[PDB]
Amino acid sequence: VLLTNLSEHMPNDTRLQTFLELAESVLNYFQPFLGRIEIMGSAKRIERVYFEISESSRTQWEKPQVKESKRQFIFDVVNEGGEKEKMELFVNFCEDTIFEMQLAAQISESSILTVRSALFALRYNILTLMRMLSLKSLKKQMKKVKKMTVKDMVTAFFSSYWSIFMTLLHFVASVFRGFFRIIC
Amino acid sequence: ELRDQQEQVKEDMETKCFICGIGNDYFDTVPHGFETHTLQEHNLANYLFFLMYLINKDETEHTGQESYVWKMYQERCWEFFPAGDCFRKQYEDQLN
Amino acid sequence: FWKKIIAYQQKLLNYFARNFYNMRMLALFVAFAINFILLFYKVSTIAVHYVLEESSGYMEPTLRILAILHTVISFFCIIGYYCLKVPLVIFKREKEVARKLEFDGLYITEQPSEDDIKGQWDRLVINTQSFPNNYWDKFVKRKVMDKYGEFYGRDRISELLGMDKAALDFSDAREKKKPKKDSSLSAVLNSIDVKYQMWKLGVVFTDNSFLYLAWYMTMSVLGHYNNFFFAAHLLDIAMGFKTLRTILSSVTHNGKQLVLTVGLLAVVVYLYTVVAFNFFRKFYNKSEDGDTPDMKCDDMLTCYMFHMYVGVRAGGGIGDEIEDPAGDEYEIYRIIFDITFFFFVIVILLAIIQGLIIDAFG
Amino acid sequence: TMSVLGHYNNFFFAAHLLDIAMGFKTLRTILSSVTHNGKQLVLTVGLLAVVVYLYTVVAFNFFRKFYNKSEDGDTPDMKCDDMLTCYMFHMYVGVRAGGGIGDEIEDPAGDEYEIYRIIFDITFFFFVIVILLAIIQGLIIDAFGELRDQQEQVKEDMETKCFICGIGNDYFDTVPHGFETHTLQEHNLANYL
Amino acid sequence: ELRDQQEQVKEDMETKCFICGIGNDYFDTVPHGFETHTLQEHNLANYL
Numbered sequence: 010v011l012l013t014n015l016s017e018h019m020p021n022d023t024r025l026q027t028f029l030e031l032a033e034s035v036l037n038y039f040q041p042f043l044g045r046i047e048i049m050g051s052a053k054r055i056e057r058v059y060f061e062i063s064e065s066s067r068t069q070w071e072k073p074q075v076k077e078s079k080r081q082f083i084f085d086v087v088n089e090g091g092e093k094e095k096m097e098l099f100v101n102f103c104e105d106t107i108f109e110m111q112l113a114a115q116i117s118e119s120s121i122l123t124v125r126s127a128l129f130a131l132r133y134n135i136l137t138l139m140r141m142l143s144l145k146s147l148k149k150q151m152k153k154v155k156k157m158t159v160k161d162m163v164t165a166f167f168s169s170y171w172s173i174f175m176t177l178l179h180f181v182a183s184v185f186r187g188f189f190r191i192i193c
Numbered sequence: 194e195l196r197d198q199q200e201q202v203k204e205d206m207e208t209k210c211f212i213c214g215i216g217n218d219y220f221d222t223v224p225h226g227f228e229t230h231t232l233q234e235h236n237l238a239n240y241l242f243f244l245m246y247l248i249n250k251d252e253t254e255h256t257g258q259e260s261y262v263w264k265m266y267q268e269r270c271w272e273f274f275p276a277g278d279c280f281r282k283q284y285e286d287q288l289n
Numbered sequence: 290f291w292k293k294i295i296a297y298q299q300k301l302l303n304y305f306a307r308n309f310y311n312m313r314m315l316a317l318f319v320a321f322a323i324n325f326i327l328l329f330y331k332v333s334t335i336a337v338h339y340v341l342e343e344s345s346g347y348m349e350p351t352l353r354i355l356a357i358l359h360t361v362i363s364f365f366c367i368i369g370y371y372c373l374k375v376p377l378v379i380f381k382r383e384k385e386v387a388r389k390l391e392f393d394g395l396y397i398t399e400q401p402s403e404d405d406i407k408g409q410w411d412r413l414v415i416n417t418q419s420f421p422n423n424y425w426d427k428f429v430k431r432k433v434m435d436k437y438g439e440f441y442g443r444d445r446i447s448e449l450l451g452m453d454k455a456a457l458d459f460s461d462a463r464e465k466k467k468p469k470k471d472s473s474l475s476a477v478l479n480s481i482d483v484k485y486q487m488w489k490l491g492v493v494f495t496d497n498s499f500l501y502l503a504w505y506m507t508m509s510v511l512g513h514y515n516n517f518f519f520a521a522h523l524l525d526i527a528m529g530f531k532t533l534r535t536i537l538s539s540v541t542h543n544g545k546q547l548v549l550t551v552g553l554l555a556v557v558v559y560l561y562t563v564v565a566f567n568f569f570r571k572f573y574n575k576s577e578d579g580d581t582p583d584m585k586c587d588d589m590l591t592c593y594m595f596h597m598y599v600g601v602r603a604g605g606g607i608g609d610e611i612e613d614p615a616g617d618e619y620e621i622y623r624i625i626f627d628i629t630f631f632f633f634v635i636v637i638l639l640a641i642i643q644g645l646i647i648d649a650f651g
Numbered sequence: 652t653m654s655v656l657g658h659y660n661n662f663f664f665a666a667h668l669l670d671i672a673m674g675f676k677t678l679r680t681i682l683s684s685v686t687h688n689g690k691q692l693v694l695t696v697g698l699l700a701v702v703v704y705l706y707t708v709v710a711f712n713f714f715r716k717f718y719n720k721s722e723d724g725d726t727p728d729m730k731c732d733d734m735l736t737c738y739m740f741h742m743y744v745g746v747r748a749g750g751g752i753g754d755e756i757e758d759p760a761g762d763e764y765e766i767y768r769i770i771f772d773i774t775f776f777f778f779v780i781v782i783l784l785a786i787i788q789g790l791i792i793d794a795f796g797e798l799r800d801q802q803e804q805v806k807e808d809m810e811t812k813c814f815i816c817g818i819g820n821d822y823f824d825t826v827p828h829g830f831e832t833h834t835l836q837e838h839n840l841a842n843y844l
Numbered sequence: 845e846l847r848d849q850q851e852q853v854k855e856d857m858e859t860k861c862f863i864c865g866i867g868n869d870y871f872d873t874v875p876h877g878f879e880t881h882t883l884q885e886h887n888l889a890n891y892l
């Protein structure tokens with residue numbers, strides 16, 4: 010807290026950033042804990058205040074129901090909130106939130122099958138197409154069609170994507186079969 | 194009406210800071226200064242945590258600032274909340 | 290030889306990529322013509338046949354030729370998509386996985402959620418040696434090596450990323466240097482990397498647009514067996530014209546809300562069915578013949594779905610279908626029930642749907 | 652030419668009543684409300700026709716017995732024997748009917764395909780009747796809203812900034828009445844003309 | 845139209861002073877200065 014105060018009031022001093030670099034790890038650890046606000050000071054000047062924030066307070070602040078209540082409060086204050094009573098409604102909300110926070114903490118102390126089926130279907134429906142190159146029938150195809158023909162070459166070029174489409178159809182059918190087995 | 198109210202809430206929060214009420218453009222003159230201000234300088238959660246910490250703290254252990262804010266909170270005087278001014282506005286000369 | 294064949298194949302790929310959109314237009318044109326011809330079918334009279342009776346007489350061979358042409362054009366559409374859009378999808382996936390690997394460390398620091406199908410499949414691309422083949426930053430393996438080598442184990446991270454330090458250093462020194470002639474089939478067979486191709490095929494199969502093209506394809510093929518499957522191809526005008534896409538976006542913008550409104554309407558109709566099944570049961574006699582005791586609301590399921598069908602469709606409500614309450618003990622109760630049904634189910638909920646559409650367009 | 656033809660047949664004088672639209676500016680506004688989205692309206696009708704065609708395909712494939720329309724039991728009057736006749740039957744009576752095609756065709760009670768016909772009728776009513784007509788109505792409503800918002804935008808722009816130079820009204824209004832002083836003497840559209 | 849007119853009335857009154865016509869932000873530079881101005885400095889009832 011002392012180092013952060015010095016950093017925020019001595020912005021340009023290079024020796025101070027050297028100390029900050031030396032002590033980054035402590036500051037990294039205490040980043041969630043340190044909290045800062047600005048208040049209208051007694052000397053008629055804006056003052057920055059640093060204080061300790063409990064990680065329990067942070068957690069019960071970040072719980073979803075508190076977030077929904079905060080959003081509803083924001084909606085209400087934006088829509089039908091007066092400039093005089095805005096700050097007062099905020100304080101009342103803060104008090105109620107703190108009480109419910111403490112009560113929550115006090116009471117507090119002390120798909121995968123379908124995904125796997127689809128992945129396995131992918132694997133054994135793509136290895137089926139890999140198996141032509143694995144079984145090297147294209148080599149004997151080349152031996153029997155050593156005479157280069159544009160007719161045959163275009164036919165094989167089409168057949169490649171035709172086989173890809175058949176593998177996709179088998180994949181979709183396998184996925185549907187696996188999903189039906191899962192549900193039943 | 195419901196949808197327009199949601200749009201108004203979004204526009205108000207992205208155009209002006211909730212606490213002090215200064216427009217986003219003045220803070221955004223410095224790069225990313227608007228959300229920097231709304232997330233560190235003036236944070237709703239930070240004010241709530243400060244209220245909690247001040248309530249839980251003992252009386253005689255209070256510092257001067259903490260005791261002064263405590264007295265205003267007891268008397269329900271919200272002048273300590275910044276209004277129309279901020280640290281950057283107060284120290285435009287020195288900071289820049 | 291091999292250079293000539295690869296050059297001619299590349300020319301074919303480039304031509305298809307150039308003409309992807311034109312034949313996408315032409316497929317819709319043929320789908321319109323085929324359905325215009327289909328609109329003239331006639332049934333003839335166990336065995337029942339559909340015959341094509343026309344003054345021209347010649348648009349039956351024309352219909353067969355158009356079906357064959359539609360299928361050929363459709364197949365060429367898959368060829369064009371696979372040579373045009375697939376590289377962009379692979380590049381986007383490769384950049385996403387590279388940045389998640391280097392910055393977030395999604396496969397080193399943390400692990401995939403086991404629900405993310407794409408992450409579970411992209412576990413393999415790291416082990417693939419051709420990591421960002423399409424993504425031009427070929428350099429991310431060594432960037433990640435520098436970033437996370439110190440903690441997670443040099444050898445373990447190297448084996449996770451598929452690279453080998455000993456071979457790297459030996460290649461920096463003198464190494465085995467021998468090129469190979471391109472005409473050898475063994476060169477191509479060894480050069481093919483089955484792992485990366487399997488990953489790419491998985492990504493392409495998971496891609497939605499190629500799945501839509503495959504669906505269009507199977508529908509054309511089925512339309513050959515039964516000509517009426519060519520009509521399902523008319524659902525393509527929505528993506529054919531951007532303005533129809535806007536009109537459909539007007540209603541699909543609030544699809545969740547629309548579905549939940551239908552669920553609410555069904556619940557309200559169920560409550561009214563409960564009330565009717567408890568008290569107002571005599572009035573649901575539907576037999577035009579007085580003698581036959583045809584009861585719609587004896588069974589709770591039959592009463593509910595009677596309310597689902599006729600009460601909802603009728604402009605006035607269930608009262609226009611069921612017997613009038615004149616001269617009955619429960620006259621006023623039935624009357625309030627009918628008025629409330631008309632006010633809530635008909636006047637309000639349908640208005641809710643209409644307002645959903647209107648305000649979505651707004 | 653319509654007046655000249657009305658001399659031969661007096662009823663051609665009725666076509667001259669289409670002139671009130673340009674006779675009165677307010678009727679022109681009312682018609683501009685609907686004609687503002689003419690392309691969208693036409694494409695919505697095309698979409699409705701395609702959907703009705705798909706439903707006709709389904710009915711012609713499976714639900715054909717239910718389309719008997721002869722009030723006499725003896726005469727076998729079939730609406731959906733011919734695909735063209737089935738389609739345009741769906742075009743006419745299914746579209747016009749408030750409930751849908753089900754209110755016209757035979758009920759599915761005691762049939763093998765009862766549930767399928769029922770889902771078909773419910774979907775027809777939900778899509779063709781409830782949704783697409785609502786799409787047209789919303790088109791009209793929001794087009795009228797667009798017109799009004801455009802008028803408001805014109806008013807706001809003219810009262811907030813000067814038309815010629817483009818300076819805001821506040822700077823001129825620093826001097827009392829300086830904004831309309833500037834817009835009426837300093838920078839006047841009629842004066843430039 | 846009726847609802848939008850009500851919204852416009854509300855927005856105009858909360859954004860600028862009715863009499864002089866200066867924006868609310870300039871007065872609000874001083875805390876609470878806008879409604880201070882509209883309730884003491886420039887008051888419709890006071891003029892009446």
Ligand SMILES: Nc1ncnc2c1ncn2[C@@H]1O[C@H](COP(=O)(O)OP(=O)(O)OP(=O)(O)O)[C@@H](O)[C@H]1O
Pocket residue numbers: 076206207209210211212213228231232235236237238
């Ligand atoms: N004084 C303020 N304190 C906090 N947020 C403020 C303040 N003034 C303006 N804001 C804005 O209000 C918003 C508060 O954060 P935000 O709403 O993003 O929180 P969240 O719960 O993480 O997300 P979501 O946007 O879904 O509600 C931010 O856009 C922030 O810039």
Ligand SMILES: Nc1ncnc2c1ncn2[C@@H]1O[C@H](COP(=O)(O)OP(=O)(O)OP(=O)(O)O)[C@@H](O)[C@H]1O
Pocket residue numbers: 809810812813814815816831834835838839840841
């Ligand atoms: N450069 C400009 N020249 C003229 N008028 C301008 C200019 N810039 C802004 N204005 C504004 O545009 C309006 C033009 O005058 P105005 O529209 O009142 O004329 P009108 O025909 O007498 O009345 P009406 O308001 O019914 O159209 C005024 O409100 C004026 O302040």
Ligand SMILES: Nc1ncnc2c1ncn2[C@@H]1O[C@H](COP(=O)(O)OP(=O)(O)OP(=O)(O)O)[C@@H](O)[C@H]1O
Pocket residue numbers: 857858860861862863864879882883886887888889
């Ligand atoms: N010159 C002005 N004189 C008076 N009120 C002004 C003036 N300029 C702006 N206003 C604003 O107009 C409003 C007038 O007061 P207000 O409408 O709140 O009175 P009310 O009758 O007590 O309540 P209500 O809001 O229900 O009408 C205030 O919001 C005030 O800030």
Ligand SMILES: [Ca+2]
Pocket residue numbers: 253254255
């Ligand atoms: Ca002390």
Ligand SMILES: [Zn+2]
Pocket residue numbers: 210211212213214215230235279
């Ligand atoms: Zn602020």
Ligand SMILES: [Zn+2]
Pocket residue numbers: 813814815816817818833838
């Ligand atoms: Zn000007």
Ligand SMILES: [Zn+2]
Pocket residue numbers: 861862863864865866881886
């Ligand atoms: Zn004033």
